[PDB]
Design a protein around this ligand. Structure first.
Ligand code: SAH
Ligand code: SAH
Ligand code: QPF
Ligand code: QPF
Ligand code: NA
Ligand code: NA
Ligand code: NA
Ligand code: NA
Lengths: 318, 319
């Protein structure tokens, strides 16, 4: 078993070959595929692609019957190139992620606050993405897709209608607030991120800002989704301090994050270390940082997403 | 979820790599419990960040956690020894050259030029490329030396090497298999053929710089071909075995020894052979077919059980 654990990478690489080529897009709506006919149609090598299909059956990605193959129920997402899972495998084993992982070991002996990613590429993750269209488009697309998947549940567990002026900080392409604004109308909607060129969307104010320097005041609802996992404890407190300075007594901050729970994998925690010198935090750790910034936890809920549990934390100023 | 953690399979390999390649794992010898605060003080590794990696290694079953200390699992004792095959395996498994080969795998399936994904990434076939890369050649040859050393006792146990006079190991690399056999089976002539820019030296071994695609030398009564055919197409595999038939007389024997594909075990190795070589992991049946096409007869077959994989042992003579 230990040699196949060492060879874990091979599972990721096999899925990449199947999905990144678009071969998986021939397996829509649970159809059984004749690999002989797929080979003639697409010009993929029959015998060598048949061998990859056998390894995908072993992995449980494909199901074998009547001398054909279908995607498993869970793996229907691989037939859709717009699926978050399609964008995830495109990034997971890309050359930039690989080269960052190869600096991980060395990064554990350095104290200069440089991520494994920065050691490999010469700039921190988001600064590097500014000059790399492959990384930025695919990463921003992944975040747009997971945002889209949480909007319904989020609207369900919190009354957005009470609020007037809403700012999503580090909101990226602004998918979260665009989808919220279609359901909760007649509000003011703003999205802050790092924009070389401002996005444009009906009734969205896009702001080019820096949440390490300042959060703009005069909003009664702030959102910070999947940002703190990219930052040290020190940088996290600084971001939360900037919220406290921007917020008055009536303001609310919705802190929304993939949350660390003992039953689930630590693999994401380690990726945040490699890419950002960040971490996946528990409810307790998030509460500690918030208290250090002079904020108080007024509500906590868990949102069950398919891939991971999510922490919903409503914060107000002390 | 299960699907997102399968997509993230690479993270397991990378975590093991960071733990072993740094030599951190060499602090966990003899199943001792390590205090990560002490290890940090001694080695200068970040306590908090290394403690998180240890928790992932516990999840994987590489480490065992008791009273805020960590030991290697019984199975993973090998990670504390930098001479172990497993140490060399993880240093190659996610190295930049293997990674870049894997990123060409999908594209390689639409080409019919007989270029491996490795050659598409690097501009030369695997072994030709290793001639100009000491990192890959030294670590690959070291891995092969370690797995050769692990099979020698079982091999001597299942075959009578003492009946033979002149022994050639073809593609024998650093010559570890014949060096270890020669310490237990004395008074013989021992030769090792491979691609040598400079000939290795070892008491009573004749190292030959050769090419088994062009010719194999006649005048030996025992020939060995271990873990070579998995690096070659069916066509090139047949050519290698024909070259043996042309080298052999009716009294010659060839021992064809290979990791063998059985349905109970993972297809992951078969796919690696495609990526690196346009090779494949073959069944007993497939090996016997290639041998028949080359004009060789199966005298004997056995299975050798190694910890990680089954091995095919096939004795061949000419028709
Ligand atoms: N200093 C900074 N100021 C503002 N935004 C920043 C920033 N550093 C990083 N970001 C942004 O932080 C985001 C992290 S990814 C999270 C995106 C979005 N909140 C979602 O959950 O889907 C990226 O969009 C990145 O561009
Ligand atoms: N054309 C060629 N002629 C001879 N040896 C070759 C060759 N092409 C590759 N090789 C050798 O084939 C070997 C494959 S790895 C097997 C090594 C050894 N027999 C063992 O089992 O441990 C390598 O040592 C490589 O250098
Ligand atoms: C670098 O990857 C991420 C960074 C984030 O800030 C947030 C997420 C990710 C992910 O990779 C990710 C993922 O692969 C699957 C589901 C969710 C996420 C993130 O939220
Ligand atoms: C390129 O990898 C190999 C080529 C071979 O001819 C034989 C082996 C290998 C391996 O990679 C390998 C491994 O990773 C772990 C255990 C055994 C082997 C090979 O025998
Ligand atoms: Na296609
Ligand atoms: Na990612
Ligand atoms: Na050469
Ligand atoms: Na040898």
């Amino acid at each position: 078993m230990l040699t196949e654990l060492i060879a874990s990478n091979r599972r990721s690489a096999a899925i990449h070959a199947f999905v990144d080529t678009g071969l998986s897009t021939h397996f829509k709506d649970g159809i059984y595929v004749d690999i002989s006919e797929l080979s003639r149609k697409s010009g993929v090598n029959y015998a060598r692609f048949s061998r990859l299909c056998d390894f995908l059956v072993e992995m449980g990605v494909l199901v074998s019957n009547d001398n054909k193959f279908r995607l498993s129920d869970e793996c229907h997402v691989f037939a859709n190139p717009e699926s978050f899972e399609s964008f995830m495998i495109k990034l997971e084993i890309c050359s930039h992620y690989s080269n960052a992982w190869l600096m991980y070991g060395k990064s554990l002996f350095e104290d200069d606050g440089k991520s494994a990613f920065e050691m490999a590429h010469g700039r921190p993750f988001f600064e590097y993405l500014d000059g790399n269209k492959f990384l930025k488009s695919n990463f921003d697309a992944l975040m747009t897709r997971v945002s889209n998947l949480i909007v319904e549940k989020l609207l369900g567990i919190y009354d957005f209608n009470q609020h007037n002026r809403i700012l999503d900080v580090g909101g990226g392409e602004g998918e979260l607030l665009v989808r919220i604004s279609e359901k909760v109308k007649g509000k003011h909607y703003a999205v802050l991120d790092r924009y070389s060129e401002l996005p444009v969307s009906d009734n969205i104010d896009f702001i080019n800002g820096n949440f390490l320097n300042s959060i703009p005041s005069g909003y009664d609802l702030y959102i910070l989704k999947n940002v703190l996992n990219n930052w040290s404890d020190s940088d996290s407190i600084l971001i939360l301090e900037n919220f406290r300075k921007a917020m008055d007594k009536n303001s609310s901050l919705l802190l929304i994050n993939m949350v660390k729970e003992p039953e689930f994998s630590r693999s994401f925690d380690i990726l945040m270390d490699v890419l950002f010198l960040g971490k996946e935090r528990s409810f307790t750790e998030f509460e500690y940082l918030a208290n250090q910034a002079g904020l108080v936890v007024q509500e906590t809920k868990v949102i069950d997403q398919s891939y991971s549990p999510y922490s919903f934390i409503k914060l107000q100023i002390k």
